[PDB]
Single-chain antibody, 239 residues
Framework: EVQLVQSGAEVKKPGESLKISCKGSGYSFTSYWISWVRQMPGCGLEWMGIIDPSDSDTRYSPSFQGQVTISADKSISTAYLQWSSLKASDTAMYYC???????????WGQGTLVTVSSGCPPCGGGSGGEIVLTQSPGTLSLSPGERATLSCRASQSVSSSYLAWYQQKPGQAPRLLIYGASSRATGIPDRFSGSGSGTDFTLTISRLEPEDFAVYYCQQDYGFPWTFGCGTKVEIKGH
């Protein structure tokens, strides 16, 4: 089985340096890129940057360029995320995730909590020109057994091969649900299905089972920086 295992929780003060790690197992490390993804408390997922372990080529979201360094030691299948000077706003769960441009981010580490002593990026997008994914509605309250329909709209056309859906169950790391707009990832129940193209995408859950109450994120890796929607929380209707 493919696994990514991350290092333990860290507590730091602003200004301190920090390096956290992501160890891959069960697959050829150099054949897949490693992305780093941040989730500040109460916020959605943010793509930070990516490394190709074969040659250590990197790309960074403009928000993180110059703040962090992504590196890799391919001889021990480990990727790293390093700060020279932590900020108070770097308090977050940090995830690493594998991909190769065919199945979006198909395996995720379990997360490293980084706490720094001493708000969220705007869901409607900032001044950077990134592709914005808008998810409707932000919260869906339904009864168990009901059908759930979630929407993801992109600010520009994205090739269907590069639109994915992730499920984040409470307190867990995200996992890949749908890749390439309509393909179910391995092991995912077939009550989940995705459709759409261009700027309009849909995730359907044919019946809400108890384990499906969670948060669902869409994501695109068609253009840089890669981006996530702000998520739709699916919760149980009061009765």
């Amino acid at each position: 089985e493919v696994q990514l295992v991350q290092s333990g929780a860290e507590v730091k003060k602003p200004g301190e340096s920090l390096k956290i790690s992501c160890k891959g197992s069960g697959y050829s490390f150099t054949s897949y890129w490693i992305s780093w993804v941040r989730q500040m408390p109460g916020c959605g997922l943010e793509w930070m940057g990516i490394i190709d372990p074969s040659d250590s080529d990197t790309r960074y979201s403009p928000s993180f360029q110059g703040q962090v360094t992504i590196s890799a030691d391919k001889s021990i299948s480990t990727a790293y995320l390093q700060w020279s000077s932590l900020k108070a706003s770097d308090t977050a769960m940090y995830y690493c995730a594998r991909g190769d441009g065919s199945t979006d981010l198909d395996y995720w580490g379990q997360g490293t909590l980084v706490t720094v002593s001493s708000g969220c990026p705007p869901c409607g997008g900032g001044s950077g020109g990134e592709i914005v994914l808008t998810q409707s509605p932000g919260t869906l309250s339904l009864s168990p057994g009901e059908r759930a329909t979630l929407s993801c709209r992109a600010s520009q056309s994205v090739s269907s091969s590069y639109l994915a859906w992730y499920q984040q169950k409470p307190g867990q790391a995200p996992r890949l649900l749908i890749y390439g707009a309509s393909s179910r990832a391995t092991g995912i129940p077939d009550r989940f299905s995705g459709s759409g193209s261009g700027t309009d995408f849909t995730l359907t859950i044919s019946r809400l089972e108890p384990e499906d109450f969670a948060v669902y994120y869409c994501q695109q890796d068609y253009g840089f920086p890669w981006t996530f929607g702000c998520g739709t929380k699916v919760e149980i209707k009061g009765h």
